[PDB]
């Protein structure tokens, strides 16, 4: 009952006293305000354009420009569920609606075709199994806004239209993408499931605890930041049930493996592998239950405020079990993880006179070679003095201190990335059931947009992907939307909402671009950081308005900057130091040869040559395009996540930060095209079968369009509310939802008529008897009356006294 709608619905009873206020659209209005973004004001003085208001907030006075004022919606629209229904669609109204709901506990709000999700920063009782039970098969307009309706609506469209769907969850770092991705998958897994190691559903869910252990790590913005992107496809069979699932990963930040910045951590897997949560494993990995003991993970923080590294390690172990992993594969992974931990502890020194580099004990290199399945002596040899071959030769040569710390770092980075990708394949192996697949629902969760005090390649790459996804949204929400109208013969004058990021995207992606210059300079044996900065400034400085010389530092303690990039979500100062190196990853075939033939099964697999790499940017640029295209083949459903404030605090709203997010996101624009265009569209085939019942009148097959025309015509639908396409019928916002209501009113009526027919049959059955019982009762009442009149007749009361003696 109502109880489950605690943090989902609007009381409206107590909120009925919130829509019953003294309002006046001529008096009350929104006025810009440094603090709260917009302040509720009440107009007073008049002066051509110099309008003088009174800010209700602090009962103060202020004079604003008649052009800075914004219309305020009446109380009637408080905490409105779908913002596209407000009377005034302006940045202030949208801000107030979300803020109002946010403070009430309502974190989900619809805005035309997409959904808005504000991070709650605390657990809400809205994801139980009971809530899931109330959202199944529901229409968005029929039940409160919830991430679940988006998932369901996605499922409904997939079976109805027979087309793949994709849920794109966008947002800045920490806005709540991953959290929402989880619930969407959990929801589909509990309404689409079919009839040691668990079932498929269970496995889809357990796939999360492990990838996150290896792919997430504390960050200034997120204590559980996702340092890799993932596209997960859930497959469906004929009967509309789950039949498999695959996962795809994108750009796993390898720098974090051997380095961390202040107040930041290495991947979670490292701290839980040293949590002594499972003692019987310390001797399998050979580690001391002390994280602050290893240099590869003790550079920053060791513990996270809301992360219990212990229980988390237990859940990880369990996940691996439910995932169908043997005790071997499972321990195989755990070991290679510790191998890296130890790699950081290996010590080296520069030989006495020949200032070069040599071993310095072997306790650590021994533990390493042990877990990895090789010879500790064959290891240090390949690190201290390699034999660079040429075609089929060898050139033995030693190295110095930094040359060696890099080769070891490189070995850690390679083993980890190589193992993460193995973890994914293995997981897909499990989720790949050979059931029949017809359609899929894809969920995308990339690493959100972010700005650190120091931004390098990592951030360029990430913000790039976000740039390109925001563009996939406006192209789809503003350009295709309109191309579609025109293509259907609909008279439509094109509108330009000003949502195009090609400039910044082409600056990075195209041949002119940064990544192209970077890719070019990895082919030059002696390219330098300075050389790169030149080619960049040469083709873009003062030459492109998106490329800009680093402005004046606007934050406490921020590292070197070589150029700023005007991204959709903000301007970012990048440092191009070490990029040439980070882009192309050196493959020391001396060590890949060793690890190649390792007694260790996993490591042996992780390192296989073949039979008889490009740069990272090239790989990323291609992969991103391969995916961006696959998404055009689907029907996107967008969820826009939003981070409330910068304190990870519940209920606190930073008006300027939210506004900034609503702006670059294009929320306002999205709501406008929804009310300016025809968001609803239905192929005539589907329209017929769903609404013929709204006018059974006809029906003496008949083509779909004609039938669709008779129904709308006969329904007296204002010709302005819809358009007959050449294939689909388009509806204004709000329309198709009332037809759904009528169609339900109709169904409830037809049902009540069938019930009256039953009531009428029960009676008509008892008719014969009723009239035959009228005969019976008239006879009974008549003969009882005679009997009475007689027994009480003076005369009879005499004929009986004499009768005896006759």
């Amino acid at each position: 009952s109502d109880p489950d709608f605690q943090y989902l619905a609007v009381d409206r009873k107590k909120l009925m006293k919130e829509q019953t206020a003294a309002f006046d659209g001529k008096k009350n209005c929104w006025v810009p305000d440094e603090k709260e973004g917009f302040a509720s004001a009440e107009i007073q003085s008049s002066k051509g354009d110099e309008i003088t208001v009174k800010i209700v907030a602090d009962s103060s006075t202020r004079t604003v420009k008649k052009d800075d004022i914004q219309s305020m919606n009446p109380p009637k629209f408080e905490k409105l569920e779908d913002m596209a229904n407000m009377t005034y669609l302006n940045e202030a109204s949208v801000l107030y609606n979300l803020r109002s709901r946010y403070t009430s506990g309502l974190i989900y709000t619809y805005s035309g075709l997409f959904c808005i999700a504000v991070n709650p920063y605390r657990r809400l009782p809205i994801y139980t199994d009971s809530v899931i039970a109330k959202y199944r098969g529901k229409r968005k307009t029929e039940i409160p806004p919830h991430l679940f309706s988006v998932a369901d609506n996605a499922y409904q469209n997939m079976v109805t239209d027979r087309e793949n769907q994709s849920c794109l969850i966008t947002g800045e770092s920490g806005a709540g993408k991953t959290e929402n991705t989880k619930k969407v998958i959990m929801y589909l897994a509990k309404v689409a499931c079919a009839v040691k190691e668990g079932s498929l559903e269970d496995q889809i869910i357990q796939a999360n605890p492990v990838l996150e252990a290896y792919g997430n790590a504390k960050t200034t913005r997120n204590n559980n930041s996702s340092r890799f992107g993932k596209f997960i496809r859930i497959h469906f069979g004929p009967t509309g049930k789950i039949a498999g699932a695959d996962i795809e990963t994108y750009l796993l930040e390898k720098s974090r493996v051997t380095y961390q910045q202040s107040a930041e951590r290495n991947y979670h897997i490292f701290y839980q592998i040293c949590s002594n949560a499972i003692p019987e494993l310390n001797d399998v990995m050979l580690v001391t239950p002390d994280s602050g003991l290893y240099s590869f993970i003790n550079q920053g923080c060791l513990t996270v405020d809301n992360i219990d590294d212990v229980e988390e390690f237990k859940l990880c172990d369990e996940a691996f079990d439910i995932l169908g992993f043997t005790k071997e594969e499972k321990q195989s992974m755990f070991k290679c993880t510790a191998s890296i931990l130890h790699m950081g502890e290996m010590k080296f020194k520069q030989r006495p006179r020949e200032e070069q580099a040599e071993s310095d004990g072997t306790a650590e290199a021994e533990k390493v070679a042990f877990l990895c399945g090789i010879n500790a002596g064959d290891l240090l040899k390949a690190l201290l003095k390699p034999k660079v071959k040429v075609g089929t030769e060898m050139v033995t040569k030693g190295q110095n201190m930094n040359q060696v710390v890099n080769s070891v770092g490189a070995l850690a980075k390679s083993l980890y990335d190589r193992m993460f990708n193995w973890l994914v394949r293995r997981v897909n192996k499990t989720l790949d059931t050979k059931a029949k697949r017809n359609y899929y629902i894809g969920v995308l969760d990339i690493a959100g947009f972010e700005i650190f005090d120091f931004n390098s390649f990592e951030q360029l790459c990430i913000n790039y992907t976000n740039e390109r996804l925001q563009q996939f949204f406006n192209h789809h929400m503003f350009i295709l939307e309109q191309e579609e109208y025109k293509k259907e013969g609909i008279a439509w004058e094109f509108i330009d909402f000003g949502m195009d990021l090609q400039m910044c995207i082409d600056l990075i992606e195209k041949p002119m671009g940064i990544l192209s210059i970077l890719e070019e300079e990895c082919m030059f044996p002696k390219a330098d950081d300075k050389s790169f900065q030149d080619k960049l400034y040469q083709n873009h400085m003062g030459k492109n308005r998106m490329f800009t010389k680093p402005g004046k530092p606007t934050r406490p303690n921020q590292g070197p900057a070589h150029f700023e990039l005007h991204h959709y979500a903000g301007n970012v100062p990048y440092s191009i130091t070490g990029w040439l190196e980070k882009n192309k990853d050196p493959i020391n075939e001396n060590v890949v040869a060793l690890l190649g033939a390792s007694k260790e099964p996993l490591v042996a697999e992780l390192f296989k040559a073949p039979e008889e790499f490009q740069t990272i940017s090239a790989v990323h640029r291609e992969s991103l395009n391969k995916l961006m295209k696959n998404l055009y083949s689907t029907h996107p459903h967008f969820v826009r996540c939003i981070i409330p404030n910068e304190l990870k605090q519940p209920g606190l709203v930073d008006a300027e930060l939210v506004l900034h997010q609503l702006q670059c996101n294009g929320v306002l624009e999205g709501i406008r095209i929804c009310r300016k265009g025809f968001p609803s569209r239905l192929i005539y085939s589907e329209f017929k079968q769903r609404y013929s019942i709204l006018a059974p009148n006809a029906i003496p097959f008949v083509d779909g369009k004609t039938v669709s025309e008779k129904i709308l015509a006969g329904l007296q639908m204002d010709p302005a509310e819809y358009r007959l396409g050449t294939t689909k019928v388009f509806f204004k916002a709000g329309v198709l939802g009332n037809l759904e209501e009528m169609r339900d009113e109709r169904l409830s009526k037809i049902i009540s008529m069938f019930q009256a027919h039953i009531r009428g049959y029960l009676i008509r059955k008892a008719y014969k008897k009723l009239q035959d019982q009228r005969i019976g009762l008239s006879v009974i009442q008549r003969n009882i009356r005679k009997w009475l009149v007689l027994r009480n007749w003076q005369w009879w009361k005499l004929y009986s006294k004499v009768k005896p003696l006759l």
Partner: protein, 155 residues
């Protein structure tokens, strides 16, 4: 709305019968208005009968044969279900699309939605129509729909 000859008298007949069963006195209780029309062949929804004057419980108001005639002609023109309307309603409750609906669902639809029939009526309409559910416990609603529409005395 122009009652023929048979109709005008079948109503008089049916009127007296119901008049007799609540105390022959030229009156019929308003709570039996709907029931009287059902006897005539009309299948009025309870919403209609309340409209044309029908009461909610016995004893509130009686009706002379005069005030009756209008009500009958009022319910006379309301909408009556058609096979197609009924079959489209039932189809929204059948997933497999084979023409089968759980026996539990049937009782659900009939007693939970619309103007809810009591469990007693649902049982009785099922015994009368001889609705047989099979082993899996399903029923072919098309068959049930046809029976209900055919009336108590088919052939």
């Amino acid at each position: 709305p122009k009652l023929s000859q048979d109709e005008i008298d079948d109503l008089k007949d049916v009127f007296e019968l119901f008049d007799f069963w609540d105390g022959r006195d030229g009156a019929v209780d308003a709570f039996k208005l709907g029931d009287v029309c059902r006897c005539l062949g009309i299948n009025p929804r309870n919403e209609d009968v309340f409209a044309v004057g029908g009461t909610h419980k016995m004893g509130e108001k009686s009706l002379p044969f005069e005030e009756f005639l209008p009500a009958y002609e009022g319910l006379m023109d309301c909408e009556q279900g058609t096979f197609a309307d009924y079959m489209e309603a039932f189809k929204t409750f059948d997933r497999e699309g084979q023409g089968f609906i759980s026996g539990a669902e049937l009782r659900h639809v009939l007693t939970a939605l619309g103007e809810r029939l009591s469990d007693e009526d649902v049982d009785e309409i099922i015994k009368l129509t001889d609705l047989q559910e099979d082993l899996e416990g399903n029923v072919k609603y098309e068959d049930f729909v046809k029976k209900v529409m055919a009336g108590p005395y088919p052939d």
